[PDB]
Design a protein around this nucleic acid. Sequence first.
RNA 1: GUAUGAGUAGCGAAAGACAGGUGAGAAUCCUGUCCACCGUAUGACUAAGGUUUCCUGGGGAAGGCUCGUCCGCCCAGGGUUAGUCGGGACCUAAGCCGAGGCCGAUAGGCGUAGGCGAUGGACAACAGGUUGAUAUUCCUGUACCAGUUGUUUUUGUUUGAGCAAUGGAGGGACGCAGUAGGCUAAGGAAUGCAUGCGAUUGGAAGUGCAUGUCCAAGCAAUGAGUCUUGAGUAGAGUUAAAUGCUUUACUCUUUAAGGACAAGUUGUGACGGGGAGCGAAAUAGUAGCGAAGUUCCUGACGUCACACUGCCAAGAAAAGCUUCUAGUGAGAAAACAACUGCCCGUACCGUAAACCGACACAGGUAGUCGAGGAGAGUAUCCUAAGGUGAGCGAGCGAACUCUCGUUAAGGAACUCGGCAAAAUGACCCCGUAACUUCGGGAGAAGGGGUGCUGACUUCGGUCAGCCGCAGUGAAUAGGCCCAAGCGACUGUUUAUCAAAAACACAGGUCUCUGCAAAAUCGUAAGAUGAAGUAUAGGGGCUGACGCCUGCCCGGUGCUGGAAG
Lengths: 89, 275, 44
Amino acid sequence: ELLDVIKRPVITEKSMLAMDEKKYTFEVDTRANKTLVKQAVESAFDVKVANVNILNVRPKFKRMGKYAGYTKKRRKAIVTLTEDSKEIQ
Amino acid sequence: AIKKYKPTTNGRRNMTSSDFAEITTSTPEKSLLQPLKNNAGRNNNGRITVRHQGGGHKRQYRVIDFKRNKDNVAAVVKTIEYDPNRSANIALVHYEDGVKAYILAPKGLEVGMRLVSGPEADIKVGNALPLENIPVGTVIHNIEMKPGKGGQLIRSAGTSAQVLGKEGKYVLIRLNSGEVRMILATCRATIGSVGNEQHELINIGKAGRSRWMRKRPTVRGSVMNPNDHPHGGGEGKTPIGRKAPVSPWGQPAIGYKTRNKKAKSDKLIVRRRTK
Amino acid sequence: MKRTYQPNKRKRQKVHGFRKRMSTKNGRRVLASRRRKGRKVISA
RNA sequence: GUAUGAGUAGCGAAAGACAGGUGAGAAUCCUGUCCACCGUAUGACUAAGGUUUCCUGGGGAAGGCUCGUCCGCCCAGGGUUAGUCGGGACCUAAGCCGAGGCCGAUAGGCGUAGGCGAUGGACAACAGGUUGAUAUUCCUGUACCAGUUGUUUUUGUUUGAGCAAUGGAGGGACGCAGUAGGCUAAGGAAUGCAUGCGAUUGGAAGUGCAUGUCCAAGCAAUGAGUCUUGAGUAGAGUUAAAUGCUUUACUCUUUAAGGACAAGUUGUGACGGGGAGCGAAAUAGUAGCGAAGUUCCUGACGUCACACUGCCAAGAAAAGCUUCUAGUGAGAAAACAACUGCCCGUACCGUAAACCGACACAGGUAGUCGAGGAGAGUAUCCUAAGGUGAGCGAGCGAACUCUCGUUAAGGAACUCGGCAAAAUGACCCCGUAACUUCGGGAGAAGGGGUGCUGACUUCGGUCAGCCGCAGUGAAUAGGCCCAAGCGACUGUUUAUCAAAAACACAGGUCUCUGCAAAAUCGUAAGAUGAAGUAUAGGGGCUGACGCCUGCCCGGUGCUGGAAG
């Protein structure tokens, strides 16, 4: 179903520094392999392997109004390339 | 023989143990060993049934023939070993086919005897004969109860028997403890008394040697509080106040003959003497 | 000295778990007796 | 909800002082200097447990036993990257669930086959660099394991090419104690490079101060050493088979030969990165530049390695692996090149302010590393690498309470009682009783020597000289003897008032119990006893060892009896 693989790019202080070595930080939905993300990126941007790396995130608190609730789980994806770029973001 | 340690400490004043001058090797075989546990007297349910168990060394079985059902093939016996399970020793056996097993070792077996096991085999030590082909007056072990189980009667160290005589059915046999009964005419045996004679002649000495063997201390009766034993209570040392001194459940100790009064064996037993 | 409530993660879910309270006819009594109140945490 | 106690008790073991910062406001925050504490730990790394406490930028209403510009607190943003690490797609121990099944008012209890279950088995990667936080995870270089695509040299599926069993077998495969031998780490000492020469009397070298004195996996070569005898002939067996495995008889062979393992070394890796120290180009000790790589001494229970001798209390399984046949059966099998390799954890604290104790609590917490001078040592005193200065203070120097130091003369007069303190204590040397179970008592008692310099010396010490009240000059380190009850002894005991004359204990004695044994748990199936078999197993009493263990069977229990 591989357009529900990738959601968003991550725009942070390390993620902009990953841009210099052709590395890109996407958010992949839960229960997805490394191989789906390779196939989805090759489908959507015409670039290659040089393997993905995949994280996870434990949630937090926040408090607003005497209430106590978590946030979402996440899963980052730091995809490296060999030969093309993405001046898209 | 028997060692006597020279008295150096206090827990060595009275120690005795065997020389183990009868045992050749110190390695068993791989194919004849099976594991064990220490059940510590505990059931499926896991409660203490038989008291005073558990908390010693480690052991393994040595799988020992009691049947001897190969016949007309000579057996070579080479090495004598040690059991942690039995008071008596064992022996390796080389059948000529290339089949090994362990066999209980009577007195007088040397390294390199050959023991024959058929119903036509002769009368020496260590031969397997059914209880028809044996003359009156021999000394016999591994007497079988039922035909086909292998041995269940007299197995341990330095014990003996005799055949007092035959009938057409059954065979009369004097066991140990003086008594006589009737054992069938299709039961195997071995000619000769069992090996080690000296297991009445050993001081354990320490307490910790009696806890090397898998035991545990037995508290006296009259020291328990009156809810753990019926002898209990009483301020000071007390005599046995109750008539006929009692086990911790009932059933007086000195005197109750307690077979089943309608046992099947009662037709076959003569001179129930020393029990 | 040692006091009691020394926690683990294997023991507090292989004693007070869920898969040991859908394995009797008394764990089921416990679960059904807690759902009458409407308690949020049913078990561990 | 608010008083009284009362602005009282307490502020939870420890050493700070000054200058300069920032700020409305400073003993309590930042920086600098000196001083001080631990240093077998208050130093480093991880397993549990905690669950964002981690980092960056702000804030001072409540928390912090005071203050607070600060914080493990409040707000906002942001950080945990794996073919090789620990776990799964591998195996099994204790135990648990257990198709059928066997029992049982219902409920349900027990159990074969098959499974689940690490604290254990088996398994392919090393060194450095990098950020505000991640690193056998990112990049730098060099490897390894299992595959897939094109090339590489051989055809009946007979095997003469392969593969090859859920079967035949080998192997994995194991205790405790004790010293002996070999390597490496770590350690120490000097005459190998680097800079600079004292402002307090003196010192250019040497007989001088401060500082640094190296390197991987993997691949090639070898090897201090360690273990083990090998060969043939004739038959039995391995449910059919086997060249595999086992085994019986006969002939040789033996410090020989064959085989198996092996810490470690030398090259390469490596023109690489590391380093005492120099030091900008803005506002950084930043970027960038690096000199030496020696010899002797001590040297590991870390490694070979459970290798070796000895002893009895006789010391886990299954898989991975290796062969032989059964079989299946176009023609795969070396080299080269290019690609593929899934899921979960990874921040942080981790002898603690972040775990267990309601607390930022004088308590508890498994494993590894754990330096120097004396020294047997992880003891004790002072220190290296490192980390702390304790989260209320300033004065004054009364009673009284606690913790310490000293005392004239007398030395148990105190007191239920020498309770508490005082005295002995290290190494070497002389000497040592009654009594005894011949091992002991025994460190019995009682005495003597110790520092520094020179000479002699084989070794070991001797001789001479010098000083002090005192020479193991500090800290650590048995008070002894004479009699008597009790218990033989080391052990165990009322967590939280009783540690003994109590219990256990080796030994003794009586009794029951012939195997579907007595006895016990259960309603029964079932199980323990026990895969044991009267030299064994249960029950009552006495408690090493030496000498002994008198009299009564009328009464009560037990056992035997047959007539009434």
